[PDB]
Design a binder for this molecule. Sequence first.
Ligand SMILES: CC(=O)SCCNC(=O)CCNC(=O)[C@H](O)C(C)(C)COP(=O)(O)OP(=O)(O)OC[C@H]1O[C@@H](n2cnc3c(N)ncnc32)[C@H](O)[C@@H]1OP(=O)(O)O
Ligand SMILES: CC(=O)SCCNC(=O)CCNC(=O)[C@H](O)C(C)(C)COP(=O)(O)OP(=O)(O)OC[C@H]1O[C@@H](n2cnc3c(N)ncnc32)[C@H](O)[C@@H]1OP(=O)(O)O
Ligand SMILES: O=P(O)(O)OC[C@H]1O[C@H](O)[C@H](O)[C@@H](O)[C@@H]1O
Lengths: 143, 143
Amino acid sequence: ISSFEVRKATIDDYFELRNLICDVTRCTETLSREQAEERFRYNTYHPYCLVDTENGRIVGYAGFYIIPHLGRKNDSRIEHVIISKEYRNRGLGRLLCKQIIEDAKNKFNCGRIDLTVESHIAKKLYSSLEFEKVNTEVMRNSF
Amino acid sequence: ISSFEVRKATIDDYFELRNLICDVTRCTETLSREQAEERFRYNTYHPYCLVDTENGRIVGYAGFYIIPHLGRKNDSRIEHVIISKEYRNRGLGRLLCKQIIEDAKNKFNCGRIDLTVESHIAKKLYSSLEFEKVNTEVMRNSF
Ligand SMILES: CC(=O)SCCNC(=O)CCNC(=O)[C@H](O)C(C)(C)COP(=O)(O)OP(=O)(O)OC[C@H]1O[C@@H](n2cnc3c(N)ncnc32)[C@H](O)[C@@H]1OP(=O)(O)O
Ligand SMILES: CC(=O)SCCNC(=O)CCNC(=O)[C@H](O)C(C)(C)COP(=O)(O)OP(=O)(O)OC[C@H]1O[C@@H](n2cnc3c(N)ncnc32)[C@H](O)[C@@H]1OP(=O)(O)O
Ligand SMILES: O=P(O)(O)OC[C@H]1O[C@H](O)[C@H](O)[C@@H](O)[C@@H]1O
């Protein structure tokens, strides 16, 4: 009977969000308030977090990004969806993304959502939400 | 001996860019002045065009997008790279990307640049610019 709420992440959650991402992810930097303010005020970046209502704690995070397109509805992407190791395999990853996916379709009027999966849990998550194989090749230049 | 210049695309170029972008890509819409103005004011979206200095025409386009990150240098992506059928295989595809790639590294302090490619010409261009194949799986939810 544990309550949860999906909500937009904020600057006041920076360090708790950073502890969640950097517990599972490749982190290299701790932002100042001026840098953090900059990244949160990029108007294409929509950080979602998932909160436990019982203890006010953030337990999930997902980064949603608008990719503007000229001549079509904007594209978008989901990167860095993370659920607290404690809370996994309970439907909160699905709960979080479904809120994202509906905001993309009808709140931001996007034409599509793109993502890279590389996981095993992840691929079975997004297939279950109508993400289908895209027949491209990803390439990366790392600095 | 034709001179060219890379510059940031602007609203005043909307219809000339749309004619260029929509020939190889899947366009569905032509934006109003308010929608177009809105998309040009997304502060992660850096539309690059390449102009023929001789005849003021836009002959190339590439979309550069910042992907904000918490705890790391920002990511970025290159989408919609096209050179006019007339101007190809002359080094203008490389010229455009190298300006972007240098602005990503040292103007926006990105950690990496991501992209998806499909045609042969394209993949050989970015491999020659230190893009390496990632071997992930791209998925899409299309609305
Ligand atoms: C940036 C990228 O490339 S995408 C991936 C980014 N982030 C990560 O992988 C972080 C590490 N992993 C996690 O945090 C979580 O496991 C996530 C985010 C992948 C999924 O979050 P969860 O809360 O565990 O997922 P949830 O409980 O909603 O289940 C999602 C679907 O995936 C499946 N699934 C979830 N966990 C597992 C598991 N351990 N084993 C097999 N299947 C699983 C489920 O079948 C589920 O569908 P179902 O409930 O109808 O059966
Ligand atoms: C992220 C994305 O946008 S991917 C989608 C790619 N965009 C498109 O396909 C739109 C249609 N095609 C084009 O607009 C252009 O052909 C581009 C953008 C792919 C390349 O632009 P160009 O101006 O022709 O490239 P440029 O003259 O700089 O040479 C690019 C490299 O690609 C290769 N290349 C170029 N043309 C060819 C060709 N006809 N056949 C084989 N290789 C070629 C070469 O290796 C060349 O390197 P080099 O000059 O050292 O020999
Ligand atoms: O899905 P489309 O809009 O038709 O795009 C086709 C796509 O081909 C490649 O993957 C490029 O990286 C994209 O920038 C381009 O848009």
